[PDB]
Amino acid sequence: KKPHVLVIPFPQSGHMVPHLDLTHQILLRGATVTVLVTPKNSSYLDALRSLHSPEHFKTLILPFPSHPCIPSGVESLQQLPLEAIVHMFDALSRLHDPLVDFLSRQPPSDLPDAILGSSFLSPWINKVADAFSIKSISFLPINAHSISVMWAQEDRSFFNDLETATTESYGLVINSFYDLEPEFVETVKTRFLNHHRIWTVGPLLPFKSSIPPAKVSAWLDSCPEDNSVVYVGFGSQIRLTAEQTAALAAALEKSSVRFIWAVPAGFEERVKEKGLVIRGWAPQTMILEHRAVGSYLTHLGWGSVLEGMVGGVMLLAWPMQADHFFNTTLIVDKLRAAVRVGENRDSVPDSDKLARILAESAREDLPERVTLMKLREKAMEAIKEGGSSYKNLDELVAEMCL
């Protein structure tokens, strides 16, 4: 017996991509899933659709409910400011009625053994699940340390409903692995889940612009030295000031390392044929996995951490939004597996106390790199057969059958 699972992801890519990586994981273990999405997000499901038949994999596209504080044709958080997350909560809560009407029509046999939807949508998903007495398992792309700090806040702002709803769900799946933060998985399991089901499942991995992906790799292979090129790649929303962009640009120039800057700049695109600046979509996972890339200058969002860990690079941390600081606390301060180069959203670095940092960052001797590599070895063990994430994938799938 294998379960049918209604997957309801959150339309921001930090959530969507691991949530679809986990659905792929589920489908490999024999489940059949249907994915509910909004129309402008149907393209996201193209990879999945190419890999499993309509027999096992199904789309349920519902119209995006309107809301006057979201501009039209905007159905995902990549396109609007960090405040409007509350507006996207309000809009997608109005898929409640369309979703109950869809499930009420199915033959009761066809109804899902479980819903595996975002923890962010749990306030209404849990009501849908209860109505049909279905398992409601939540998902998070953030780690247990972050969940720990967030759930403990006495003022959880407008995350109060979804955090409360997540604590009330059947259980919670997260994109981390146990040996990375076991204290924090255990706090979450005991302190913030009413039942006590947490599945660490990470690192969830892909199952795979101005310059094409085939040409960046030719430039990477042009690099003679292994472990010798620094990738600077900042993820949305926050863009840098003209002053911050100019500071980092002088750091990369004066540093005279080879670099790839994925993005004002100035004179400097043609100045240094040691650096390559790409505008738009960047083959990120491909860059960090190349032997020539030895450090990664990032805000230290969680997906960035696991990409850099799994790719085995020095993480240079410049946190600016809350999750970035939790991860700095974890990866830099507590684990000494990364180096801090920026303080916060308004910092302006000095051009060669950072260029010094960069030109010495890819070097394999420094303790942060050696700690990060031991963590990478732990991360590999978790997803291989026998590892805790693998087993938690097996156990989660048998659990949804209950």
Q: What is the CATH number of the domain that holds 300?
A: 3.40.50.2000
Residue keyed to tokens 């951490």 = 305
C-alpha–C-alpha distance, residues 176 and 204, integer Å: 8
Nearest to residue 302, comparing CAs of 18, 44, 86? 18
**Measured between alpha carbons, how far is 323 from 251 in angstroms, rounded to an integer?**
26
Q: What CA–CA distances, in Å, run from 209 to 212, 214, 221, 279?
A: 6, 12, 20, 6
d(CA 172, CA 199): 6
Report the amino acid identity of residue 226.
D
* Cα–Cα distance for residue pair 225/55, rounded to 1 Å: 48
Task: Specify the residue for token string 């792929």.
Answer: 24
Known catalytic residue at 15: yes
Count of CA atoms in the C-beta half-sphere (13 A) of 122: 25
Residue 284 is labelled as binding a ligand: no
Is the Cβ–Cβ distance between 284 and 313 less than 8 Å?
no
282 carries a ligand binding annotation: yes
Q: Which two tokens stand for residue 127?
A: 């009501």
Whether the Cβ atoms of residue 284 and residue 307 lie closer than 8 Å to each other: yes
* Phi-psi region at 266: left, alpha or beta (left = phi > 0; alpha = psi -120 to 50): left
Rg (CA), the chain: 22
* Nearby residues of 208 by Cβ (< 8 Å), 6 or more positions away: 47, 285
Give the SS3 label for residue 164: helix
The tokens for 284 are 């990120």
The alpha carbon of residue 186 and the mean position of all alpha carbons in its chain are separated, in whole angstroms, by 21
Give bridge partners of residue 15 from the DSSP assignment: none
For residue 79, give both structure tokens.
Answer: 């396109």
- What are the phi and psi torsion angles at 293 (to 5°)? -105, 120
Report the alpha-carbon distance of residue 21 to residue 17 in Å, rounded.
6
- Is 15 among the annotated ligand-binding positions? yes
First to last CA, the chain: 10
Q: Is 113 one of the annotated active-site residues of the chain?
A: yes
State phi, psi for 234 to the nearest 5 degrees.
-95, 135
CB 297 within 8 A of CB 341: yes
* Angstrom distance (rounded) from CA 370 to CA 14: 27
Q: Of the listed 15, 24, 145, 290, which one is catalytic?
A: 15
Q: What are phi and psi of 305, to 5 degrees?
A: -60, -45
- Rounded to the nearest 5 degrees, what angle is found at the Cα of 52, between the Cα atoms of 120 and 41? 40
Residues 335-351 as b/e (b if ≥16 CB within 10 A, e otherwise) read: bebbbbbbeeeeeebeb
In angstroms, the Cα distances linking 329 to 105, 149, 346 are: 49, 11, 19
The three-state secondary structure class of 152 is coil
The contacts of residue 268 (CB under 8 Å, 6+ apart) are: 249, 253, 275
Overall resolution, Å = 2.7
Environment class of 128 (CB within 10 Å of its CB; exposed 0-12, middle 13-18, buried 19+): buried
Would the CA dihedral through 383, 387, 393, 394 be positive or negative? positive
What tokens appear for 380 in the block?
Answer: 């590999």
H-run or E-run covering 160 = helix 160-168
CB–CB of 145/37 below 8 Å?
no
Experimental method: X-ray
Rounded Cα distance between 258 and 222, Å, is: 11
Alpha carbons 290 and 228: distance in angstroms, whole number: 10
- The parent domain of residue 276 ranges over 213-380
Close Cβ partners of 40 (under 8 Å, ≥ 6 residues apart):
64, 73, 74, 75, 76
Which residue from 335, 346, 337, 325 is spatially nearest to 373, judged by alpha carbons? 337
Residues 354, 360, 363, 367: what is their CA dihedral angle, to the nearest 10 degrees?
-70
Of 4, 21, 113, 145, which is the active-site residue? 113
| Residue 280 near residue 255 (C-beta atoms within 8 A) | no
Q: Is 307 annotated as a binding residue?
A: yes
Treating both helix axes as pointing N-terminal to C-terminal, what angle do 96-105 and 122-131 enclose, rounded to 10 degrees? 30
Are 88 and 63 within 8 A, CB to CB?
A: no
Alpha carbon distance 213, 270 (integer Å): 20
Q: Report d(CA 343, CA 157) in Å as an integer.
A: 24
- Secondary structure of residue 210 in the 3-state scheme: coil
